[PDB]
From Swiss-Prot, chain A:
Component of the 17S U2 SnRNP complex, a ribonucleoprotein complex that contains small nuclear RNA (snRNA) U2 and a number of specific proteins. Part of the SF3B subcomplex of the 17S U2 SnRNP complex. SF3B associates with the splicing subcomplex SF3A and a 12S RNA unit to form the U2 small nuclear ribonucleoproteins complex (U2 snRNP). Within the SF3B subcomplex, interacts directly with SF3B1 (via HEAT domain), SF3B5 and PHF5A. Identified in the spliceosome A complex; remains associated with the spliceosome throughout the splicing process. Component of the spliceosome B complex. Pfam families: Beta-prop_RSE1_1st, Beta-prop_RSE1_2nd, CPSF_A. Residues 105-119, 145-168 are annotated as: Interaction with PHF5A, SF3B1 and SF3B5. The modification Phosphoserine is found at S156. Its main location: nucleus. GO terms for biological process: mRNA splicing, via spliceosome; negative regulation of protein catabolic process; positive regulation of DNA-templated transcription; regulation of DNA repair; regulation of RNA splicing; RNA splicing; RNA splicing, via transesterification reactions; U2-type prespliceosome assembly. Belongs to the RSE1 family. Residues 1009-1030 are annotated as: Interaction with SF3B1. It comes from Homo sapiens (Human). Residues 193-231, 770-788 are annotated as: Interaction with SF3B1 and SF3B5. This is Splicing factor 3B subunit 3. SUPFAM superfamilies: WD40 repeat-like. The lineage of its organism: Eukaryota, Metazoa, Chordata, Craniata, Vertebrata.
UniProtKB/Swiss-Prot annotation, chain B:
Phosphorylated. Phosphorylation occurs concomitantly with the splicing catalytic steps. Citrullinated by PADI4. It is found in: Nucleus; Nucleus speckle. The record marks E31 as: Interaction with SF3B3. HEAT repeats lie at residues 1-27. Component of the 17S U2 SnRNP complex, a ribonucleoprotein complex that contains small nuclear RNA (snRNA) U2 and a number of specific proteins. Part of the SF3B subcomplex of the 17S U2 SnRNP complex. SF3B associates with the splicing subcomplex SF3A and a 12S RNA unit to form the U2 small nuclear ribonucleoproteins complex (U2 snRNP). Within the SF3B complex, interacts directly (via HEAT domain) with SF3B3, SF3B5, SF3B6 and (via HEAT domain) with PHF5A. The SF3B subcomplex interacts with U2AF2. Identified in the spliceosome C complex. Belongs to the SF3B1 family. Residues 74-130 are annotated as: Interaction with SF3B3 and SF3B5. Disulfide bonds: none annotated. This is Splicing factor 3B subunit 1. It comes from the Eukaryota.
From Swiss-Prot, chain C:
One of its GO terms (biological process) is stem cell differentiation. Its main location: nucleus. It comes from the Eukaryota. Zn(2+) 2 binds at C22, C25, C57, C60. GO terms for molecular function: DNA binding; RNA binding; zinc ion binding. This is PHD finger-like domain-containing protein 5A. Signal peptide: none annotated. The record marks Y99 as: Interaction with RNA. The lineage of its organism: Eukaryota, Metazoa, Chordata, Craniata, Vertebrata. Residues 34-50 are annotated as: Interaction with SF3B1 and SF3B3. Belongs to the PHF5 family. Pfam families: PHF5. It comes from Homo sapiens (Human).
Amino acid sequence: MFLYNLTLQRATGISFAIHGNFSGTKQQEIVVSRGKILELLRPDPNTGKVHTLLTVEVFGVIRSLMAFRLTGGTKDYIVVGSDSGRIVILEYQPSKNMFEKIHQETFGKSGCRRIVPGQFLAVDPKGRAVMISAIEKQKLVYILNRDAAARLTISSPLEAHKANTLVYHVVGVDVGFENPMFACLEMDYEEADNDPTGEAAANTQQTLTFYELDLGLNHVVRKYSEPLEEHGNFLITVPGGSDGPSGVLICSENYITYKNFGDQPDIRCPIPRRRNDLDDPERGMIFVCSATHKTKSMFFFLAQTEQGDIFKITLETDEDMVTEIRLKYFDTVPVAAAMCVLKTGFLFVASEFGNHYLYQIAHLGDDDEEPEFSSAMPLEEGDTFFFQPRPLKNLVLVDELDSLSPILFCQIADLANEDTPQLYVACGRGPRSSLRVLRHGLEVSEMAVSELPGNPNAVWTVRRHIEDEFDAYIIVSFVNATLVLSIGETVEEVTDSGFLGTTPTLSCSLLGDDALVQVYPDGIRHIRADKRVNEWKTPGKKTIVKCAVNQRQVVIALTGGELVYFEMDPSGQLNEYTERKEMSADVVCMSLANVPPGEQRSRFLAVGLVDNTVRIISLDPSDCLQPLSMQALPAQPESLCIVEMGGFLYLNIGLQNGVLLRTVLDPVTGDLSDTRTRGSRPVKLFRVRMQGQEAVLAMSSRSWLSYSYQSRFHLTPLSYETLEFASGFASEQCPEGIVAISTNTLRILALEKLGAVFNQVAFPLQYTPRKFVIHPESNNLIIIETDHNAYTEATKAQRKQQMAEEMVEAAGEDLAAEMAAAFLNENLPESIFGAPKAGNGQWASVIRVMNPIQGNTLDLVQLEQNEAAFSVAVCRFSNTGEDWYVLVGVAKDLILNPRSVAGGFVYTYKLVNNGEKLEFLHKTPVEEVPAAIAPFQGRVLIGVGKLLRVYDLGKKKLLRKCENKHIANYISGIQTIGHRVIVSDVQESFIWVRYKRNENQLIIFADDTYPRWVTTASLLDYDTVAGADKFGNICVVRLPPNTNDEVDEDRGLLNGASQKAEVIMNYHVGETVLSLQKTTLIPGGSESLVYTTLSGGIGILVPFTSHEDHDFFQHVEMHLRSEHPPLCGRDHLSFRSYYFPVKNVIDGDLCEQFNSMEPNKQKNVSEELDRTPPEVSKKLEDIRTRYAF
Amino acid sequence: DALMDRDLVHRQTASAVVQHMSLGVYGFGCEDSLNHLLNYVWPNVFETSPHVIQAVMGALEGLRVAIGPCRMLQYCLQGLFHPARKVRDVYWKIYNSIYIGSQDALIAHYPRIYNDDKNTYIRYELDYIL
Amino acid sequence: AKHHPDLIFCRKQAGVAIGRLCEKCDGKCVICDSYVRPCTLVRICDECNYGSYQGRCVICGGPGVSDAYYCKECTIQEKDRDGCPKIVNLGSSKTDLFYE
RNA sequence: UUAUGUAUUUACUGACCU
RNA sequence: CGCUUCUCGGCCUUUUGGCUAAGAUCAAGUGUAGUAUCUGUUCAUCAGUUUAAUAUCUGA
Ligand SMILES: [Zn+2]
Ligand SMILES: [Zn+2]
Ligand SMILES: [Zn+2]
C-alpha cells in the first residue's frame, strides 16, 4: 500500500566509460556510467586493482557522456547529456569528494525524445565548443570559454538544424586552433518516404557532413558533405594540428575508411575476418569500440570488432597527406561497450554483459612477428587478409571487476542450510554466462591451516618492534599451554623463546620498543631481550582476572575491580600506582584504546560490570580513578571495545545478545548509542586492522565486521562459520589478516573484497539461462539455456568436420591435410574468443541440472538445432503418485523478427532418482510456443500463446483437459494462488482467471485497464499482484473488495472483462525488472519485495508500518527534491513518473542522499523537519537495518 | 455538479478548477478523483466558444501529467480517425498536445496495430521475450 | 498572454540572457500569467535581447525591473522548455487605446 | 416541433486595459 | 313544497392611518477580445459541388 524503494547492490553494468585527469593531477581516472548511476574509478597503478572513489545517482538515463579539456587546462570536465533537456558540465572536486555541477543549460523538453538533442555528443578536441545532437532534425553547438577567474563559461546555443535528417554518430574533428569542425554520418529520407516504389529508399546512402563553427561570425555552417559507398556506423577522431593528419576514420561493415576532405583520396581497408571461423553464412563485421591512444611519439587506435578481436590501427603517412592505413590483430578480450586505454599503459575494457576487466599492456606497438597487412596493397577477392586468433600475448589480466548484469532470473532461497537466505542468480549473455550465488558476508579466504588440539581459548598477535611486519611470534592459550608459535614457515610448537615466560599464559602485547608484557597467573612479564620479569600481582591472594592492555599504558584487574595500572618507565622498567579503588567486584570486561601522540597517559578507561552497568573513567593523573560519565545496559556486556575509524571514539560495547556503537568524545562524552543485534551466544569484540585503518570484529552465532568505509559503518557479516575468537595478523605469507580461532584448528584468513555487500561465486554456463526452478526435495537447480544465433555443439562438430572436408577437397594435390586435422583438434575457448553465431533463426538450447552447492553439471540434456527452450517447471502430478516431473516448453523455427513460429513442443521428463539425472518420458506437440508452464492442483497449466490449456499426463503425450481462447495477444506468465490464475499478457496486463472444480472451465473475471508490457510478476496477497514491465516500471494491481469470483459462462465493459482491477502503485526504476520475489532477507527482519533488474542492480520495496513513518519520509524526500536536485537536471518526481505517474512509493535512494550533503543543508532540512541530522540519519538507516542489509 | 450543469460558464470555470487541482495533487496518489472528473470534462471537447475550449484544453493538458499519458491516450483513441472532420481535428489537436507534452511516455502506451498486405505495423522488438 | 489571444510568442532558441519584467507586471508568470509559485527563470533569445532591447520587459516592452519567472504549473508541464517567451507583436490593445 | 439567415437588445466570459 | 326577514359559518380591496410646499429633494461611464440568449425574421426531379450523413449551384 505505502512502499519505500531501497537499492541494496546498485547497478554494475557499464554503458559509457571515459578517462582523463578529472582529479586535476598527473594521474588519470575513469568515469563510467552505469546508466542511472555515474561513478568515478581510480586505476591504482602499483597494485593494479580498481577502486571506486564516488558513485552518485543522477536519476536520469545518461544518454551520452564525454570528457573535455579546456584550452591550456589541467583538469578535465565531465559533460553529461541525458533524458532531461539539459546539457550539464561536471567537475570532480576531490576535496569535498563530490561532482560539482558547473553549468546546466536547458534546450528542449525532457524524456528520451526523438527531436531534442542528447543522444549524440561531440566535443572539439582543443576544448572550445561542444555539440549535442539528436537522432533527428536538430543539433546544438555551445561555445565554451574561460573568464578571468579561471572559470568556465558557456555561450548561447548555436543552431545547426536540418530537417528530415537522421544522425548515426557525431564526432569532434581536430583542427589545431582553427574553426572547430564536427563530423557526422547523416541521411536524408524525405525522398525515401515520398516514393512508394520502394527502390528510392534502397539507394539513399549516408553522407559524411562537416559543420564548421565561424567563431568570427557566430553560427554553424555545413562546410562539406560527401556521400558514402557503404553505411558507416561510427567515427573515430584522428589527432591533428601538429600531432597528426587531422581527419576522421569511418568504421563500417567489413571496412575502415580514412576520408579527410580537401585532398586525401579515400583510403579503404577491408576488415580482417578470422581464418575459417564458423559464423558466416552471409554476415558482415563491424567495430564496436575505438580507444584512441597518443603515446607522444605516434598515435594508434585499439579498435575492436564485434567478436572481441582488438586491432592496432596505425596511420602511416609519408606526406602531410595520408598515404595508407594499416592494422593487425592486437589481442582478444570479451566484447566491450567502451575502452579507455590509459597513459601509464593500462587498458580498461567494460564488457556490457558480465565482468569488466583491467589489463596491463605488456607489448605495445607489437611490430615484430605478426602478419600485418595494410590498405593499399593490391589484394582482391573480398577480404583475403585473415588472421589466426590466439591467446594473450600483448595484454596480461590484472583486475576482474565484478558485475551481475544481466540478472535474467533470480531466487531467494536457503538451499545451503545457512541461517540467512541466499540469492541464486542467472547472469551473463552467451558463453560467458554464469549462475551466481550471493550471500551477505565478506570474502573470508583461508591461506594457511593448522590443527591446534585440545580446545584453545584465545590467541594474540605481537611483533618484535612497532616498526616491522613479520610479527615475530603468535601466542595461543586455553588454561595451561602458552604455545607461542613462530609465525612463518614450519609453524609448530615452540620451546622457551626469546620472549617466552611461563606456560599458563593469559595475555601478551608489545609495550616498549621491544619490551613485551605477557600476563599469566603470576602475571607481570616485561621481556625485551633478557626476560626482565617482575611478577608481583599479589595483594595477598588474587592473581587471575581481566587483562586490558594498550601500547603505552596498562590497566589490569584482580577479583575486585578498579585497580592497578602497572605502567613502565620511558627510559627503564615497570612501576605502578598504589592508588586503588578496589570496587566491589562486578567485572565481566574491560577495554581501552591508545592514541598515536601522547607523552602522557593518553587513553580512556572503559570497564564492564557484572551488574547491568558499564563505566568510563578517565585516568589522567589529575582526575585519576574518578568516574566520568554513567551508563545503561539491559543484561550483561561480556565485551567492550574502543576504536577510531575515520580519516567520536566509537564506543562498542556488545551485550550477550546485541551490540551498540556510542560516539564518546574525549573531554565531553555525548554517547549517542547506535543499536543493532548480533542462539544468541555472548558476543566478543576484537580490534583488527584492514586496508589501512582498524575496525571491530564482533563475534557471535555468526561473525560481524564493523568497518568505516568512507564514514558509513558497514556492519557486514562474514561468510565463514562461528569462530569464537579473533585477533589481527600480519606476515609476508599474507600481508594483513585475522587469526581467529578458539575451536580445534587454526586459520590464517584474508578479507579481500572489502568495499562491497555481496559475495559473488560463479558457476559457468554454456548459453543464456532463461529461468530455472528448484527441486524442493534434495535441493537442485534445473536450468534451461537458450540462445538465438547459436549452434548446438552437434552442429559445431558437424560444421568443423565439413570445414575439414572442403579444406582437404579444395585442390589438395600439390596438399596440406595437416590444416584440417589441426583445425579439428584445436578447440578455442568460446568464453574467451566469442561463440560462433549461427546466421539467423538458429537456436541452441540445453537443460542442466546443477548442484547449488558445488556448482557442477549434475545432468546435461541437449536439444535439437532450432528447438529452443523457453519455460520450465518441476511438478508432481495428482493422477500418478509421488514421482517428480519436469516440463520444458520448446519452440521450433521461431524466427524472431518478423515473428513466425513453426509450432512448439512440450518435453516431459521424469527426474529420477534423487533428481540427479533426467529420463525422457514423452514429447507432445503444440501449435504455438509454450512460454509458460505452471503446476496447479496436481496438473499443469500451459500458456500456448493466446491459449491457456490445462493438461494432464498420458503415457503417449500430454492430454488437455480445458482450454481458453479469450485471453489476448500472447501469454508470458502464469502464476496461481490456488483456485485463481494470473495470466500475464505480453502486452496488455494481468488477467484473473477462475478454475472450477465441478466444471473444468477457465473463466476470465477481471483484468486491468492499463497496457503494461509485463515481463514478470509475483503474488503478494490473495488479491494483489505485483508486476514489472519491459520499460522499467513496477505496478501493483489490487483487486477491488467485491470482485466476486462466481461467474459462469458477451459484452465486456471496455472491450475486456467486467470487474476492472485497479492499481495501487506505479514506480519507475530505469531498468527492466526481471525478477520480483516476496521474501525476508534477514531472520529477525521482515518481508520486503525484492526486485533484481536487468542492469545488475538489486533493490527492495518495503512497506511502511505506521503513518508517522510514511509522513516523515515523505516530507524528507519532499525536502530533498528541493534542496538536493539530481545531477542531470532530470526532475526526480518526473523521473519516477516517467511512463505512469508515481503512486504511494517513496524513493529512498533520494532519501539516503541526506547523508551526502554538506551539514549546512543537513541542518536546514533537519530543523525544517524539527529533528537533528544524526537523529535523521538514525531514523533513515533504521529502515535498511530492519528490512534488509 | 458544476460540469454536469447546463450553462457553459460553469463548465469553463469548473474546467479551470480541474486543471489547477490536477497540477496540485500530482504525485500524491489521487488519480482516481481526477479520472472521475475526466469523464465529465471530456464531453466538453466539442464546445466552440473560445474561452471554454481553451479552458477544457488547458484542463486536459494539465490532466496529462496527473493521471498519465496512458489514460489520456486511451481517451484520444477511436476518435482520431472518426468520419466527421469536426470531431477528427479536435481529437488530433488533443493528441498533438499529448504528443508534444510527453512523446516518450507514449511508447509503452500505443495500441497494437496488426499488419496489412504490404506494410509491417507490428513493433516486433517489444513483443519477443527472454 | 492568455488574455489577449492574438499575441504571438517569439519561440526561438533560449540563450543565456535572463528575462526581465516591467514594474507594472512584476510577479506575473509569462505563460500561465499568474502571481504565485515562481520556480524557473526566463531565458530569452539573442535576437530578442540585442542592444536597445536589453533589460526590457518580456510582456509590455517597458523598462524591466525584476527577473521573470515561470510558475510551478508552467514548470512541471515543461512549458519552459519550448522557445523564448518574448511576446513579439503589439496587437489590438494598447494601440487603439493610444489612439483613444 | 428541433433549425436557418439576420435586424436586435439583454446577460456573461478573459485577475483584458491608462 | 314555496316566499320574505333575522342570526351563526364556508369568504373574493383592507398598506403603517391624518395634514402641509405632489412635504422636500436625488438618480453620470469608458475602451478591447470573445460567447450565450430573447425579440424581429423567413424558409420542383435530376446530375455533379459539398457534408459524418444532411442542406447552394446547375439541369427539364
Ligand atoms: Zn504560469
Ligand atoms: Zn526571442
Ligand atoms: Zn509588463
